[PDB]
């Protein structure tokens, strides 16, 4: 049995990202068993609330990729309005296609088959820098960021520390 278009595209994209890796994140497979399950380690962007932090995530690609977007889940504990408590990232570029219903959000702003995994990750970086309050996944985080951003600042920094102590786990 030959390979689908999905498998071929992931190879070429895995090769390209793991050729000239854009700084800020590292990309690899959870297991060579499957190229449809990437793990991603993200450095907390400079100057942002998360700087110094080290966040691990998982890009799960669907069988019919790139018709559908991948799902990104933070495994590292994180506190963000656009990140569900279970870890799932919720941003526009990862929303399924497309237009409809009443004519608010267009098809060109969500997922497109052309968006490389690199394009996604870059979008999730900027998400950490500047939260989008039009799509909150964590209600509690969405409030604290608005009504007392100095206790939100505090809680993030606590989770930034706990991420470093988990790097020490490699022992």
């Amino acid at each position: 049995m030959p390979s689908s278009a999905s498998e071929q595209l992931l190879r070429k994209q895995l090769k390209e990202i793991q050729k000239n890796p854009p700084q800020g994140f590292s990309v690899g497979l959870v297991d060579d068993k499957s190229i449809f399950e990437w793990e991603v380690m993200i450095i907390g962007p400079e100057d942002t609330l998360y700087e110094g932090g080290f966040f691990h995530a998982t890009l799960s690609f669907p069988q019919d990729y790139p018709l559908m977007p991948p799902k990104m889940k933070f495994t590292t504990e994180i506190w963000h309005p656009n990140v569900h408590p279970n870890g799932e990232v919720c941003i526009s570029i990862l929303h399924p296609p497309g237009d409809d219903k009443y004519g608010y959000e267009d098809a060109g702003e969500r997922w497109l088959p052309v968006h490389s995994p690199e394009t996604i990750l870059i979008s999730v970086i900027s998400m950490l820098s500047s939260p989008n309050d039009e799509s909150p996944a964590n209600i509690d985080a969405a409030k604290e960021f608005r009504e007392n951003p100095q206790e939100f600042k505090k809680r993030v920094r606590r989770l930034v520390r706990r991420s470093i102590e988990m790097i020490l786990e490699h022992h």
């Binding site: 018709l67 237009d99 098809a107 497109l112 088959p113 052309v114």
Partner: protein, 76 residues
């Protein structure tokens, strides 16, 4: 000139197109007013499926020509 792109649903799209315009150009415009990517569009004219890299002229698509925007279906 002017062409027509009728969908399998019955919707008719009219387009002011140059005889020099590429099929890629046309596919891009149809995405911008229906919301399906080019690689999922299937355009047909006079019994042949339009391929990228060519132009309307390569298929002799003159004025009042009608293209059919079709798709494959999954039911059985």
């Amino acid at each position: 000139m002017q062409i027509f792109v009728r969908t399998l649903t019955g919707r008719t799209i009219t387009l002011e197109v140059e005889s020099s315009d590429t099929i890629d150009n046309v596919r891009a415009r149809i995405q911008d007013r229906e919301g399906i990517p080019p690689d999922q569009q299937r355009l047909i004219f006079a019994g042949r499926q339009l391929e990228d890299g060519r132009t309307l002229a390569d298929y002799n698509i003159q004025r009042e020509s009608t293209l059919h925007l079709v798709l494959r279906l999954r039911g059985g």
